[PDB]
């Protein structure tokens, strides 16, 4: 997997920025997936420099590659709620050495477009597990110390517009958008 980075929260009208690390390749590109929807191509840059964008993203996409620093990047300007999605970077290598059809994907980064502020979660003991409540935006990750019998549940969106989730064992809470570790 490729190391993908960049903020998980962007205000409407501002610019979304993401970066991935990669050594080499032939085509570097970006694909996104709105919640509950299919894969949507954003743009690709080829080793020739030839560059192609999804025409529906009109003049808002800028992609770049810096092979000498082992990275490639996406900027999407003037965002609205329609741009909320999990974004993936993709690097095509193809038939390499003995290896064949190599294509590497970033892990995926959820970007939520919203004018609401980030809010760190309040963590409470369950008795067993932990309750992670009233945070924004997604996601939170929960680890323990232990990997067996651990069940982390998808978050509820409450009427406050804030999320809550619980993790059970049969806790190390991380909220990167607010930079909180409990």
């Amino acid at each position: 997997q490729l190391l993908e980075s960049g903020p998980g929260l962007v205000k409407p009208s501002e610019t979304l920025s993401l970066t991935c690390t990669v050594s080499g390749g032939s085509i570097w590109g970006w694909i996104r997936q709105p919640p509950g929807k299919g894969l949507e191509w954003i743009g690709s840059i080829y080793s020739s420099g030839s560059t192609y964008y999804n025409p529906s993203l009109k003049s808002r996409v800028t992609t770049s590659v810096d092979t000498s620093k082992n990275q490639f990047s996406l900027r999407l300007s003037s965002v609205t709620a329609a741009d909320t999605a999990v974004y993936y970077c993709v690097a095509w290598f193809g038939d390499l050495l003995s290896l064949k059809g190599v294509e590497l994907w970033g892990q995926g980064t959820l970007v939520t477009v919203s004018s609401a502020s980030t809010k760190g979660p309040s963590v409470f003991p369950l008795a067993l597990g932990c309750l992670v409540k009233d945070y924004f935006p997604e996601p939170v990750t929960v680890s323990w110390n232990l990997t067996s019998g651990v069940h982390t549940f998808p978050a509820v969106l409450q009427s406050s517009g804030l999320y809550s989730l619980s993790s059970v064992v049969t806790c190390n809470v991380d909220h990167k958008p607010s930079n909180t570790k409990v």
Partner: protein, 188 residues
């Protein structure tokens, strides 16, 4: 653009085929790619150049293409094959990468399973947390201040949900009733 059936299903040990229909400008003149995507993970490339497998991909997956149509074939089906499958190709008239809408492959033969239910009391505020896991099929019913999640598929292809009752500490016995296939369990 590229069109796939929205749904497929198969039986463990048996085969399934997933179709992808395009045009002369895409599938007709360019290589078809196939992806498997498990929920909440990156797509994984299964097939490139119409019919070739990347290193590491099981030979249970095969691909072919005739004229303006392409197909992904999967043999020796297993439960873990349950996933969304996408086709993709370069399109000459558009100068764009195009993706199919995806086909959700369900794997049949799962037995009915009653929900595991755990209710936690409150540990300034008060939240009652009802946690529902390991049920099949993926529907449940839970019984002011109630917020209940939609059923989400677990990684083992059973289902989970959580319900949250928000109360003031002054308001705070209480019960979570979980109904699944006519069967209801209470926690208190």
């Amino acid at each position: 653009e590229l069109t796939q059936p929205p749904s497929a299903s198969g039986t463990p040990g048996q085969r399934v085929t997933i179709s992808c229909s395009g045009s002369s400008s895409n599938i007709g003149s360019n290589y078809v790619y196939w992806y498997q995507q498990l929920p909440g993970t990156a797509p994984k490339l299964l097939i490139y150049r119409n019919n070739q497998r990347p290193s590491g991909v099981p030979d249970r997956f095969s691909g072919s293409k005739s004229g303006t149509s392409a197909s992904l074939a999967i043999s020796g089906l297993r439960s873990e094959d349950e996933a969304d499958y996408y086709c993709a190709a370069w399109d000459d008239s558009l100068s764009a990468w195009v993706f199919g809408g995806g086909t959700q492959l369900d794997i049949l033969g799962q037995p009915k399973a009653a929900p595991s239910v755990t209710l936690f009391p409150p540990s300034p505020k008060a939240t009652l947390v009802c946690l529902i896991s390991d049920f099949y099929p993926g529907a449940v019913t839970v019984a002011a201040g109630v917020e209940t999640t939609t059923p989400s598929k677990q990684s083992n292809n059973k289902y989970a949900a959580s319900s949250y009752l928000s109360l003031t500490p002054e308001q705070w016995s209480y019960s979570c009733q979980v109904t699944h296939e006519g069967s209801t369990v209470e926690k208190t």
